[PDB]
Structure formats: C-alpha cells, structure tokens
Amino acid sequence: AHENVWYSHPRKFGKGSRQCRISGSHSGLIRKYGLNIDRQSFREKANDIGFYKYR
Amino acid sequence: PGVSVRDVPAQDFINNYASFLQRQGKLEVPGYVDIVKTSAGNELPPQDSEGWFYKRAASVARHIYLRKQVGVGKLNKLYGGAKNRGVRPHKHVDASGSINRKVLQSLEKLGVVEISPKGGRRISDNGLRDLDRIAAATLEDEE
Amino acid sequence: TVPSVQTFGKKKSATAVAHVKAGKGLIKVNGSPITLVQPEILRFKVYEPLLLVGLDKFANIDIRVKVTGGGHVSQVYAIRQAIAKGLVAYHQKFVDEQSKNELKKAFTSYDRTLLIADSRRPEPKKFGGRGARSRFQKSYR
Amino acid sequence: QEVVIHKIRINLTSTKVKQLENVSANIIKNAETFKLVKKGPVRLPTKVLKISTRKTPNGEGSKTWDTYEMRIHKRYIDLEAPAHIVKRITQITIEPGVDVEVIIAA
Amino acid sequence: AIISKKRKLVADGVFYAELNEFFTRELAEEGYSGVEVRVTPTKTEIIIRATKVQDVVG
Amino acid sequence: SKKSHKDKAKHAVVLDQDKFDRIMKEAPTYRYVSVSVLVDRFKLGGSLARVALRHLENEGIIKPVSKHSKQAIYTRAT
Amino acid sequence: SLVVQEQGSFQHILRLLNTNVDGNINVVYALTTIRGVGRRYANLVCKKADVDLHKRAGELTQEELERIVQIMQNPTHYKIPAWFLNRQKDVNDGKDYHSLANNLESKLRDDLERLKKIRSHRGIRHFWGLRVRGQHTKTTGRRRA
Amino acid sequence: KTYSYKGVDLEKLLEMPTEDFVKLAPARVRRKFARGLSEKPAGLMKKLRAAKLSAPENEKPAVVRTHLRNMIIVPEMIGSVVGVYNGKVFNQVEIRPEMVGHYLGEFSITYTPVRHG
RNA sequence: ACGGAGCCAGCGAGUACAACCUUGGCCGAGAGGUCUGGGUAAUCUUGUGAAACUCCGUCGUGCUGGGGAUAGAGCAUUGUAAUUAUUGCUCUUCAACGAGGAAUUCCUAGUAAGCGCAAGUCAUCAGCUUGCGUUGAUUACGUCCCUGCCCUUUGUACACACC
Ligand SMILES: [Mg+2]
Ligand SMILES: [Mg+2]
Ligand SMILES: [Mg+2]
Ligand SMILES: [Mg+2]
Ligand SMILES: [Mg+2]
Ligand SMILES: [Mg+2]
Ligand SMILES: [Mg+2]
Ligand SMILES: [Mg+2]
Ligand SMILES: [Mg+2]
Ligand SMILES: [Mg+2]
Ligand SMILES: [Mg+2]
Ligand SMILES: [Mg+2]
Ligand SMILES: [Mg+2]
C-alpha cells in the first residue's frame, strides 16, 4: 500500500467518481439538481424530499 | 406612397438586391469562395457557383433590417438545415461561421451594417435607406 | 381617443393578437401587409374573413396583427381567427348590434372555427409508447 | 436619519401555496398599513421540478415509469418604502416552508 | 452561499431526509414520531416529536 | 441489381436539328404541354425538356397557365 | 436558350486518364465516374478550369479536357487548398498528393500490404478480411455477399 | 525503394529528436505529446537506451518487458525488442523503422483469433 | 435528392468550493480555437430564427446527383490515458438495397404517421428512453369469427385443476 500507488487512479469524473449518498453505489444514480441519490432510494424518500406522484 | 422592405415579398427582394450588389463592383467576395460548403450540413457548394455570396449578403442585410440586431453565431443557427448523418438520424447543424463573418464585415465596409452597442450588428441609416430604395425598385418593377 | 379594441385568436400553440382601429383600410400582419402571408397556399384562408364579409365593410378600419407561437399553418389560422374576432368585437363595441349579428351569420355559416377557438390539442405521451396513444412492438417469442 | 428610500425588494419561494400566498398577503397588508408604495405580488411561472424514474428496482417486469415533481412559486415583491418598517416586516411573519429573501437594490 | 433556487429547495428536502433518517436510526428506542425543520432569519429550529421526550432530552 | 428492365438510352441527351424541327412543328397541336408530356415522345432527355419548354416562351408559341416549380402547365397559343 | 449543338462534333465516349467515360452526363458527374474523384472534387476542378458547370461532358472541347486533366494531377499548383485533397501528408514522403484512378487503388494496396507486413492489429484484421474500425461483428457482416 | 517517413529518410530517422518527429507526427500524436507526458514513457526510454547500449553491437538486443501500451514508438526506439503485455504474455515485438507513428498495442493482440468448426 | 431563399414552437436545463449554459467580437473551410460579456435564471444562452415545410432553380427513371455501409489519408475536441477506429470535421471508394415469403406488431382524433428539440445516461459518445411541440390523415363508431376477459347455466373420472 505504497501511498504513490494505493488509490492512485484519478477519480475526477466517470461512473465511479460520485456515489449514492444513500448506499454508496455507483449504478442507477440520479444527478438531477444535485440529488446524487440512486433511483430506488429516491423512490423511497421522494415524499420526504418533496417529490410526489401527481399525474 | 412610402415603402419598406416589409411591404415587398421576400424572395424577390433578396433576388433583386443580390443582382444590384453583383452589378456594382463593391462588396468584395472573399478569395476562398467557390471552395466552401457554406455549412457542415451541406454536402456540395452552391449550385450558382459565382454570385451566391451576393445573395447571401442580400438575405443577411434584409434579416438585420427586420430583426433587432444579429451577430454571427446567430446567423449560423439561422442558415444550415439537417445534415444527412449517413445512417444516423438527421439533426440540426449550424452553418459555417467564416462565411457569415465575412458577409458581416463586407456589409460593414459598404456601410449598410453598424456595430450595435448591445452586441451583434444592427442596420445603419445609409444601408437602411438603400434597402428601402431597392424595395421600392422591386415594388414598382412588379407593376 | 381613437375608437380601438384588441382581440386575439388561437390555434394549437399559435396566438395572433389583433388591434383594430378606425383607420384607412390597413391590414398588416407582423408589420407586413396581409397579401404576403408566407405559406402562400393558405393565403386565401387569411383573406377568408375579408371576402366573406366584403372589404367595403371595413374600408376605414385598420388592422394590426402580431402572430407568435405554433407552426406556419397554426399561425395562419390564428390570424384568421384574430381578424374575424376583431371585426366582430369592434362592430359590437362601436358600430351596431345588427351589423355584428350579420357578420356572425356570415362567419359561423362558414368554417365555425372563424369565431370559435379550436378545442383539439395534443394528447400527452405515455411510457411504453413512442406516441401519445401508440405502443412498442411485442416480441412474443 | 434613514429617510433615503432603499427601493427594496422582497422575493419568496416555496413548494406549497396557501402559506406562501398567506405570507404575501400579510406582507402587502403590512405595506399598506404604514402607507407604502409597492408593486404587487407579481406571480412567477411555477417551476415544475420533475424526475422520471423506473419503478422496478431490478429491470424485470413490464416497462413502467413514474414522474415525481414539485412546483416552486416565487411571487416577488418590491417596495419604494422607508427603511426600518420594511426590515421589521421582513423579520416578522415567517412561515416554515415559504422562504423569504430580501434584496436592498439601493 | 449562492446557489440556484430550485437546487436550494432540493437540497433543503434532502437535508430534511438526512435529519429524518438519522433521527430514526438514533431515537428509535425513544418512540420517534416525526421531525419538523423551521427556518428563521437567524436560527434553524429543529422540533423533534417523539414519545419519550424526557429521555430524549436526557 | 437485377437488370430485367432492359431499358435503352431512350432519351435525346443532346438536341439535333431534325429534332429541332420536330419540337417546333408540334410545338402547337400539343394542346397540353409539360416536361413529362415533352419527354413522353422520346425526343427529349428531360433536362433539356425544361430548356425547350422555357425557350417556347419566346414568341408566345404556348401560353402559361401556372409556372409553379417542380412542373409546368402550358397550353397552345390561340 | 437552346442550340442545335453542331451535329457531328458532340462526343459520346471519352478516355480521360485511361478510363472510358460516357460524355452525355453533366461534366462533373461524368468526371465522377473515375476512381478517386467524387462529386465535390470534380465540381471544384471543373470550377477552377472555367468550363461551364451545366455543360455536357461530350460537348466540351479537347484543350478543355487537357486543362481539366492538368488541373487534377498537381492540384496545389492551381490554388486547390492543402485540405480538400485525397491523400494529405502522404506518409511515404510527406507531400500531400491526390490519388487517381489506377494510382488510388494501387497505393491503397501498398498501404494495405504495409499494414500486413507491419504486423499491426489493423493490418492483420485487414489480412483476415474482418471489420477493422472497431464495430461489433456478432450480428453484422453475417454473409460475405 | 528505401524507407522515408514523411520525407525524413531512414538515415535521418535513426539520428533525430522526438520533437522534430512530433512536428512530423500526425494530429493524434501531436496532441498527445503536446498534452504533456507521463514519467513511465521516460523510464521506458531510459531502460531501452540502456538495453541497446548493453547489446554487443551484432545481435538482437535483450527483450524489455513492459505493460505500457498507450505510448507511441518514437524515432529513438527503432532497433529495440519489447515485450508488450497482452493480458497474459509479454508478446515479443522487434521495433522496425515502420513501427513509428503507431502505439505498442497494435502488436500485442489482446484477443486470440476465433476459429469456428 | 441536391443548391440557394423563406423562417415557425413547446416541454427543459444551466457554474462553489467549482469550473455549467453560452451570447457577442476576432481567427479557421469545418470540427474547433481565442478575447471579452451576461446568467445561481420569465432577466442571460433564448423569440432555443429546430427539422419536416414553403418558393425559385439543377438533376430526369439511369442502382442515377438515391442509398452511405465498408475502407484510405489528414485536421481537431474530451480524457492520465482514444490502438480494438471515443466523438466531430475535410477529400475519395462508393457495397447490399428494385416496396421484401410464411408470419407477425401498434393504432379510431390533434390519434396513427412523418419531423425534430429538450431532459436522464454525460469528462467525450447515441441510432435509447422519458417528455415536448410542428405538419397531420385513410378507415371504423361494429362483432364474437381468431386470441382472450366478465357473469350465469350445465357436465366432469380434473384439484400439482386440460400443460
Ligand atoms: Mg436553409
Ligand atoms: Mg434522406
Ligand atoms: Mg407520434
Ligand atoms: Mg430544401
Ligand atoms: Mg419558444
Ligand atoms: Mg432552422
Ligand atoms: Mg451513387
Ligand atoms: Mg445523395
Ligand atoms: Mg425522414
Ligand atoms: Mg439504455
Ligand atoms: Mg369498440
Ligand atoms: Mg384427485
Ligand atoms: Mg391432452
């Protein structure tokens, strides 16, 4: 785990640059308006957030 | 009585104004004409190999007269249609920027287009007078 | 002040606002005279109120129409409605009742949309279909 | 010695209506109570914040989506009004949900 | 702090979700019911509605 | 691909003198004239169909009814 | 507007750069029928030679053919830009050329056998006859014909 | 005919700097080298010059194994034997004068050819 | 189809502890580059001057100026990194394709269909999806014939229920 090599790969962008903020997962993320919550957790917490099914 | 370019059909006005600008020796054409697509969307140069630049200048001058003021990239959005992207769906492709820039500078030299404070270019009093004069020329040409 | 009113006419997403004044028989759309409506094959559509009523009905009336939104033919129908409704509203406001009812009889007996805005408008799309009411293909095997 | 009018501006936000409209109405009533000149609670187009989301967490099942949304209403107000009464108005009559912001613009 | 108003409201909602889930994790033994986030010009009051109020206070 | 059409040149790509007297002789007596009508008689390729059709508006050999693009509608001068 | 076009001089077949070309097509689209020349390049070449665009290839005169041919073999002499050329920067000698009927296919073949000898993955893919530009081949090109 | 790259002959090709080749190089290599370089290609350069020096002047120099596939073959490289990582094997490749302009990856086929039937 | 000219929307989205939407002015033929200026948004991009469409011409039934796949060379952009072509642009080769068998899918009014734009994926990449609008119809306004569904009556040796 030489600090020069450990976790040395850049992560400024791409699929794995950002996480779920709920689950830490990199799949099915919602980046709209900086929500950064994946889709399923968004469906779970939408009403608390302020999002409602309306039409 | 009085007549403005709004009182004349468009296509006839562009045709006559292009003819008048071609007749007089002013409005120098860039040396790179005859070689240019005029847009990335297009796939051939204009069919009218010489004189099409005069028509483009005529249309541009009419457009600046009609609108508030227009820059170059906005003309790029205006001209240029759909590119046949091979086997992909067509999209909108902006026209060539150099051609419209050269049109705008040439119209500046003729004095028909003035740099506007709000950005872009608007019409000038001398050029607008010329525009209505040629509109009258076309209108009394019709009958 | 000059007797003047403002009316409007709509299509799917088109909207023509027409100001009618006691003028000299002056009909402009977007600052251009009516004879140069662009699609040039629906031009008779926009003369329709003129010829149905007769130009002499409004010879000292001037027309100014600003039409925005919607595609070409939607704009054209918007101007049609704007001109017709402006004529009717002006006649009601400042001319007489009988003239207005005569105009309405001449109009509504021909293309009822001339005074009544169309109610048909696009249907929202739905998931599972590339159209508003269409659907995707099924595999089945 | 604050006689200089600040031509101040009060703008609002919310995800709900009745409390936002109530706050705006109280603001206007306060403004008229002390003889202030104003431009009314001008309505702004409710911005619809929309997300489409697939319902199924695992891709299996017939393709079913849903759309969640809020609406944000703004209703900004500006006053050609004195100093202290305006600030007192902004610092009073605050309802959770509706967010008040004040711009001096002087 | 300058940010788009729609993004500001979305952040406020996700912060409320933050608080609600965190309090659900923590005060579960307290018979947690709900949380309200009131924002004043100066203080961000956070009212906790729970059953065992005196134990929540500690 | 499948050349079962077996078509020939079948079109006068360049106008010849005798064909010029032909176009002029039945410039009238063709009571309706158009580009397709002109090429129907094997005597015009189709690009010069427009050329001959436009030239006939020289001494009023035929009269125009409508001069819309993509076609033409011409009748005999009477 | 129209001309009898001097019966007895309008050519019907031509041999420009050792390929037969039918002359009755429009000049540019008649020139297009030679390998390495397309509608854009032929259009520009005809434009530079001052010959009428709407003219037919079978009616233009002989020295017109020779001037056109000379123009489209050393293009950079006649103000044809560095771009717009067929083979630019020419990785054998660095001089932007324009390949023509036999030269185009021949030089493409030397480049192909260079890529074969170079043992590049692109070259071995060309040698095998498979797709080169990195597209999926599970479902495409599924018969040779 | 003898080898020239872009009018720069083979004789000039062996004795010539990287930067002049960049000027001769196509657009992709021009951007790559103009975008800055990693330390790993420099170390590869040093190791390869050492390997070329060590060889007794008459046989194929010792193969230098390397994982680097993303760097290109510069004019200082010809005369070299490198084993490019293939995923499994440091596949051998001797660097010909025609190597230049390309990368290394084209000569280490990461996938075995597929044979049906 | 290709040239010019006309010039028309509605959903959106957009930068802070980061570097987003980009106008405008200069360059370049283009992609693009550079210098400045707006916009944390009914304010600026934006009237998103979008395509289809319209007018005037070139083409003229020729796998042809249709079709643009497969390749060769070059120029740029994002990227630590682009070869197994990221993507965009310029020149060229231009293949199969002649309205597609059995069979089978969707759909009754601003609907189908054509046309594009926005948003989600996004450092770069859509031929995808979710939405939006433009032009906008033919044919029904019925039936249980095929495929099924609901209720009732009947028969059953079926109940893992006609697989
Ligand atoms: Mg156009
Ligand atoms: Mg097409
Ligand atoms: Mg549809
Ligand atoms: Mg067109
Ligand atoms: Mg709009
Ligand atoms: Mg457009
Ligand atoms: Mg072809
Ligand atoms: Mg084509
Ligand atoms: Mg289409
Ligand atoms: Mg997908
Ligand atoms: Mg039914
Ligand atoms: Mg049993
Ligand atoms: Mg059985």
B11 interfaces chain G, CB cutoff of 8 Å: no
Give the residue from chain H lying closest to G120, CA to CA: H106
CA of G142 to C1' of I69 (A): 13
DSSP string, F19-64: HHHHHHHTSSS-SEE-HHHHHHTSS--SHHHHHHHHHTTTTTSEEE
Q: Indicate which CATH number applies to the domain containing D80.
A: 3.30.70.600
The DSSP 8-state label assigned to residue D92 in this structure reads: S
Residue F18 host element (H or E): helix F17-25
Residue C74 host element (H or E): helix C72-90
Distance, CA of F13 to CA of G13 (rounded, Å): 13
The DSSP 8-state label assigned to residue C92 in this structure reads: I
Q: How far is CA C7 from CA A38, D48, H13, in A?
A: 50, 31, 81
A45 interfaces chain E, CB cutoff of 8 Å: yes
The contacts of residue B4 (CB under 8 Å, 6+ apart) are B132, B135
Instruction: Looking at the structure, tell me whether residues G18 and G39 fall in a common domain.
Output: yes
Domain interval for residue E44: 1-58
Which residue in the block uniquely carries the two structure tokens 């450990």?
A6
Q: How far is CA D58 from CA A28, B104, B121, D55, D61, in A?
A: 10, 57, 56, 9, 9
Q: Is the Cβ–Cβ distance between G84 and G42 less than 8 Å?
A: no
Task: List the one residue out of F4, F9, F7, F41 whose CA is nearest residue F23.
Answer: F41
Task: List the one residue out of H116, H110, H47 whose CA is nearest residue H81.
Answer: H47
Distance, CA of C36 to CA of A43 (rounded, Å): 55
Q: How far is CA A27 from CA A30, A46, A49, C67, H63, in A?
A: 9, 18, 21, 48, 43
Give helix C97-108 / helix C72-90 axis angle, nearest 10°.
150
Distance, CA of G12 to CA of H101 (rounded, Å): 48
Tokens representing residue C10 in the block? 């709509």
F55 C-beta less than 7 Å away from strand I: no
Pick out residues 13-42 of chain B having their CB under 7 A from any atom of nucleic acid strand I: 14, 32, 35-40, 42
Q: What is the experimental method?
A: cryo-EM
Tokens representing residue E26 in the block? 């923590």
Q: Which-ligand-closest: CA of C130?
A: 3
Q: Is the Cβ–Cβ distance between E31 and E52 less than 8 Å?
A: yes
Q: Which domains does chain C have, with CATH numbers?
A: 1-141 (3.30.230.10)
Q: How far is CA D28 from CA D76, D97, D103, H9, in A?
A: 12, 19, 17, 86
Output the CA torsion sign for C67, C71, C73, C78.
Answer: negative
Domain tally for chain E?
1
Task: List the one residue out of F68, F32, B16, F12 whose CA is nearest residue G2.
Answer: F12
Distance, CA of D66 to CA of F55 (rounded, Å): 66
The contacts of residue A9 (CB under 8 Å, 6+ apart) are none
Residue B82 β-bridge partners: B92
Distance, CA of E47 to CA of E36 (rounded, Å): 5
Instruction: Please check if G138 is assigned to a binding site.
Output: yes
φ and ψ at residue G53, rounded to 5 degrees: -65, -45
Task: List the one residue out of G105, G91, G99 whose CA is nearest residue G75.
Answer: G99
- Chain G residues with CB under 8 Å of F17 CB are 4, 7
Distance, CA of D20 to CA of E9 (rounded, Å): 14
Residue nearest to nucleotide I54 (CA to C1'): C39
Distance, CA of H70 to CA of H108 (rounded, Å): 12
Tokens representing residue B93 in the block? 């492709």
Distance, CA of C60 to CA of C94 (rounded, Å): 13
Identity of the amino acid at G18: N
Domain interval for residue G61: 1-81
Task: List the one residue out of D1, D20, D21, D6 whose CA is nearest residue D96.
Answer: D20
Q: Which nucleotides of I are covered by protein (CB under 7 A)?
A: 1-17, 22-33, 40-42, 46-65, 67-77, 79-86, 88-94, 96-98, 104-113, 115-117, 119-124, 126-136
- Chain E residues with CB under 8 Å of D47 CB are 6
Distance, CA of C82 to CA of A52 (rounded, Å): 40
CA of D60 to C1' of I156 (A): 39
C-alpha angle B52-B56-B60 in degrees, rounded to nearest 5: 170
Tokens representing residue C127 in the block? 């998931």
Q: Is the Cβ–Cβ distance between C106 and C50 less than 8 Å?
A: no
Q: Is the Cβ–Cβ distance between D101 and D9 less than 8 Å?
A: no
Label each residue of B54-93 as H, E or C.
HHHHHHHHHHHHHCCCECHHHHHHHCCCEECCCCCCCEEC
Residue nearest to nucleotide I55 (CA to C1'): B11
Which residue in the block uniquely carries the two structure tokens 């020289």?
F58
Domain interval for residue H14: 1-117
Q: How far is CA C6 from CA C21, C66, G8, in A?
A: 9, 11, 73
Q: Residue D50, SS3?
A: strand
Tokens representing residue B77 in the block? 């959005």
Domain tally for chain D?
1
Tokens representing residue H103 in the block? 């990368």
Task: List the one residue out of A41, A39, A17, A18 whose CA is nearest residue A30.
Answer: A39
The DSSP 8-state label assigned to residue D90 in this structure reads: H
**Strand C32-33, strand C26-29: pairing:** antiparallel
Q: Residue D65, SS3?
A: strand
Name where chain B breaks: residue before each gap, C-N > 2.5 Å.
none
Cβ neighbours around A19 below 10 Å, total: 13
Q: Residue D35, SS3?
A: coil
The contacts of residue B89 (CB under 8 Å, 6+ apart) are none
Q: Is the Cβ–Cβ distance between C91 and C103 less than 8 Å?
A: yes
The answer for E47, left when phi > 0, alpha when psi is -120 to 50, beta otherwise, is beta
Alpha-carbon Rg of chain C, whole angstroms?
A: 19
Distance, CA of G75 to CA of G68 (rounded, Å): 11
Q: Which of G81, G104, G120 is the last residue of a domain?
A: G81
Instruction: Looking at the structure, tell me whether residues G28 and G53 fall in a common domain.
Output: yes
Cβ neighbours around H61 below 10 Å, total: 20
Q: Residue A52, SS3?
A: strand
Domain tally for chain G?
2
Distance, CA of G96 to CA of G94 (rounded, Å): 6
Give the residue from chain G lying closest to F48, CA to CA: G2
Task: List the one residue out of H99, H100, H104, H102 whose CA is nearest residue H85.
Answer: H104
Domain interval for residue B93: 1-143
D67 interfaces chain C, CB cutoff of 8 Å: no
**A3-55, what's its fold?**
30s Ribosomal Protein S14; Chain N (4.10.830)
Dihedral of the alpha carbons of B105, B111, B115, B117, in degrees to the nearest 10: 180
Q: Which of G49, G81, G113 is the last residue of a domain?
A: G81
**F9-78, what's its fold?**
Arc Repressor Mutant, subunit A (1.10.10)
Task: List the one residue out of E6, E3, C130, E4 whose CA is nearest residue D69.
Answer: E6
Domain interval for residue D40: 1-106
Residue nearest to nucleotide I90 (CA to C1'): G84
DSSP string, chain B: ----GGGS-HHHHHHHHHHHHHHSS-SPPPTTTTS--SBSS-SS--SSTTTHHHHHHHHHHHHHHHSS-B-HHHHHHHS--EE--TTS--EE-PBPHHHHHHHHHHHHHTTSEEE-TTSSEEE-HHHHHHHHHHHHHHHHHH-
Q: Residue D32, SS3?
A: helix
The contacts of residue D3 (CB under 8 Å, 6+ apart) are D82
C47 CB-side CA count, 13 A: 12
* Resolution rounded to one decimal, in angstroms: 3.3
